[model samples]
Target: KVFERCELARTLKRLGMDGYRGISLANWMCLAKWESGYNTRATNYNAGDRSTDYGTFQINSRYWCNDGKTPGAVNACHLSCSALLQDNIADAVACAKRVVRDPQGIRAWVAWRNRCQNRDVRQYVQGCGV
Candidate 1:
């Protein structure tokens, strides 16, 4: 039941995220891959919490498996849809597509990364067609 649901790439298409809404397919894919290797069970390296984030969107374990402590929303689907890692694929796509559709969003995204003080992900993002 789970594997049948968490396929990020396929899920994205089903949710109408085939191209840029704010994030290009290539760029989104790169972030997804880099974050979780497309593995829904992938975890963060920090061993302290032991509950590392998981899923294609790399949803934080604390958020994905437990309550978000907010009212009226407490599911992965909701998080994903809102670019919030709510664990909902549809939500993720909706939020992502919305961002991609905005030209300012694209520029903002690039500018944010381009200004990262310690990360070299900009080059990788560019290679992925950011």
Candidate 2:
């Protein structure tokens, strides 16, 4: 599903990511934008590691979700990578929470590390009324 920016922001808020859990709502929105443009079916393959990032949050197969084809995948979320591609983001949100609890926190997301980290992300949610 393709979500409008405001719709995604509100949805993320409704999912309980409204700046809580050590990741700001704006920052999460920014991460989503940079990761998948809020496209539920988005998947990105990393050339360096041959691992893929899935869905809006771009949950990685390297350690989170299992794609079956990825070697030695940790499957830390104990879920299938395809699950993250569903239009419903429930599983993705739960898995994202786990990722945030890791040592890197939200920085576990390269998009967050490169773009949202240590930066003012207010613009990401400015008119979303979140």
Candidate 3:
């Protein structure tokens, strides 16, 4: 599903993404905007590592999801990569929660560091009442 900005904002807020792991809702929104534009089916195949990033949150097959082909995959999320591509983001949200538990925290997503960290991310959630 391709989500409108505020639509995704409210949806994520409803899913309890407002302040998950010290990462605010706007930060998550910023990550999604830079990673997949809120498109649930978005997939990015990284030739360098032969891992694919799947879904709106861009969870990767290398260490997060099992795609049965990524070399040395760990499947930390313990979910199939296909699960992240669904319109319903419950599994994706669950996985994202797991990701932040790492010491890297929200910086697990480099896109967040480059595009959102220490920036004016509040704009991503403005007027969404999140």
Candidate 4:
């Protein structure tokens, strides 16, 4: 399933991500847009390294989720990658929060660094009331 941008903002806010670790809802909106366009089942395969990014947050199987297919996967979230492809995103939000707790913070998302870093993303959630 796909989420409207505003719908996603409200969801993220309810997940306690509004000001989590200084990252704003706008940042999360930007990440979701660039990562999966709010599509829950989004997946990106990296043929070069044979890895896969799953879900709206695009958590990678290399270190975040394990499906028993990606070699050397660590499954840091301790959940199956398939769990991220569901309409309910609570699991994805929880794992993303864990990733934010890492040393890199939200910078773990390359898309955010390249597209959203140091930018005014308040418009992403302007009318969302988040």
Candidate 5:
């Protein structure tokens, strides 16, 4: 499922992503935009690590969910990477919450650092009323 900006904002708000950990709703919006463009089935393979990033937030196979092919993957989220690709984002969102629990916090996603960090991310949720 590909989401419109405001629809995603409201959905994330309902999913408790507004203030999960120390990350704000706008920041989460920014992360999702850069990571997967709000598409539920987005996936990217890392040739170097042989790990794949899955779903809207791009939860990775390296440290989060296992794709059964990432060498030395830890499966910290204890779920299959396939779960992230589903249209229902509840499981993906739960895994995302687990990601920020680590010491790196939101920095776990490189896309967030490259596109969202130190930027005016409020544009992502500007009129969403989230």
Candidate 6:
């Protein structure tokens, strides 16, 4: 899990600032681990795919959930893992990879996390490092 997860983290780190605040790869990886437990197969107990995005990032395909084009446009937005490949980290890697290229660095990533952590999520992630 460590190696695999780290690979995902590195990919995100490389492209994190593209559309997101250039948050450190480790930070974004930490978020992915928290949101999806590093489980590419994991599904939300409450929201599922439509409400919550799929894969490790837990991306929301809809506009309200994310500012991206649409979940469907990305591999992480898949209805299932059929289109995903590359050690099960490809789609997620792509998402964070794009984020890293954002130029804003962790700024946008921090804001996004803040928006998502609107409630008590901080308690869980306090020491975890957003």
Q: Rate the local accuracy (lDDT) of all candidates.
A: 0.45, 0.89, 0.93, 0.93, 0.92, 0.46
User: Can you write out model 2's per-residue Cα lDDT over 1-130, one digit (the tens) per residue?
Assistant: 9889999899889999975667789988999899999999999898888899999988999899999888789999999999999999989998998888878788777778889888888899999888
User: Candidate 1: lDDT of 118?
Assistant: 41
Supply the global lDDT for candidate 5: 0.92
Best by TM-score: 4
lDDT of 4 at 87: 98
- Tens-digit lDDT track for model 4 on 23-108? 98899999999999999999999999889999999999999988888889998999999999999999999999989999999999
For candidate 6, lDDT tens digit of each residue in 29-105?
45666666666765442344344445565544452134234445443233333222224565556554544455553
Candidates 1 and 5, the one with greater lDDT: 5
Global fold similarity of model 3 (TM-score): 0.97
Quantify how close model 2 is to the true structure by its C-alpha RMSD in Å.
1.3
Q: Name the weakest run of 10 consecutive residues (lDDT summed) in model 3.
A: 121-130
Q: In model 6, where do residues sit more than 4 Å from their true spots?
A: 1-21, 45-50, 64-86, 97-130
Candidate 3: lDDT of 59?
Answer: 93
The TM-score between candidate 4 and the true structure equals 0.97
Q: Which ten residues in a row have the lowest lDDT in candidate 5?
A: 121-130
For model 1, the stretches where C-alpha displacement exceeds 4 angstroms are: 1-10, 19-21, 45-51, 61-130
Question: In angstroms, what RMSD does candidate 5 have relative to the true structure?
Answer: 0.9
TM-score of each: 0.41, 0.93, 0.97, 0.97, 0.96, 0.45
Clashes per model (N, Cα, C within 3 A):
19, 0, 0, 0, 0, 19
Looking at model 1, which ten-residue stretch has the lowest summed lDDT? 121-130
> After superposition, which runs of candidate 3 have C-alpha atoms over 4 Å from their true positions?
none
Better of 2 and 3 by lDDT: 3
